[PDB]
Amino acid sequence: AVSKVERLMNLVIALLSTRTYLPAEKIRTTVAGYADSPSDEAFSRMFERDKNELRDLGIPLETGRVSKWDSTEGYRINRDS
Amino acid sequence: LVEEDVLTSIHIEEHEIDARDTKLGAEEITRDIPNVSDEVLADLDERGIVRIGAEVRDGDILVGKVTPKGETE
DNA sequence: ACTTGTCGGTGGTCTGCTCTAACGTCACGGCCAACCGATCGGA
DNA sequence: TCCGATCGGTACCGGACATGTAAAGAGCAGACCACCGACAAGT
């Protein structure tokens, strides 16, 4: 049982403090509050809603590949912007 | 022979290090060196390499390269 | 008042399978190029 | 009894290093992810 504000704070801290792009699975496993999702689709919907809410507040999230040798996309927040 | 440098020769050794592009991250050559003392980096210039003409002993740092480690437990 | 599990849609990317109808039809390439001794199988 | 084949072996320490080609293309479908609409129940 984690409040939504705490979940969003954990997500933004994890994105800011990580210098490399993180895929959805790593965020689900690591960041607290995403481990109680009954199904993968429910987690994806919740993460999309949270990301949309954060983007609405003006936080400049950047999406790109995890690595030049990998195809999965990741998330990262630029510290300069 | 020792005193007057009769049988004296000069030997030149070449040391090379490369910072290639890795899958898990990018390698950058700089004088960060997170875990050392302060006296070790006396001879290094602003770009993390030794200065020309600076004597180097055994174990001294020539080029300081830091590579990403990745997520480890 | 705010939020979330459940439901359905677009478009892009990575991955795999099936198809194409003039006529076609049995490969070069060759090392090896030592030296001695012991043993099994044909003539 | 003789002899063309076949297999077994032949010193040590030091050192050194990493490949060189591709006769294609198109149509359809499946799995997964970044972007989204609703809707009632719990907070």
UniProtKB/Swiss-Prot annotation, chain B:
Report which superkingdom the organism of origin falls in: Bacteria
Task: Kindly indicate where the leader peptide sits in this chain.
Answer: none
Other information: Mutations in the RRDR sequence (residues 423-449) confer rifampicin (Rif) resistance. Rif blocks transcription initiation but not elongation.
Q: What does this protein do?
A: DNA-dependent RNA polymerase catalyzes the transcription of DNA into RNA using the four ribonucleoside triphosphates as substrates. This subunit often mutates to generate rifampicin (Rif) resistance. Interaction with RbpA partially restores Rif-inhibited transcription; once the subunit is Rif-resistant however RbpA no longer stimulates transcription.
- Give the family from UniProt: Belongs to the RNA polymerase beta chain family.
Q: How does it assemble?
A: The RNAP catalytic core consists of 2 alpha, 1 beta, 1 beta' and 1 omega subunit. When a sigma factor is associated with the core the holoenzyme is formed, which can initiate transcription. Interacts with RbpA, which partially restores Rif-inhibited transcription.
Name the chain's protein.
DNA-directed RNA polymerase subunit beta
UniProt gene name: rpoB
Task: Please give the first and last residues shown and the length of the full protein.
Answer: 732 to 804 of 1169
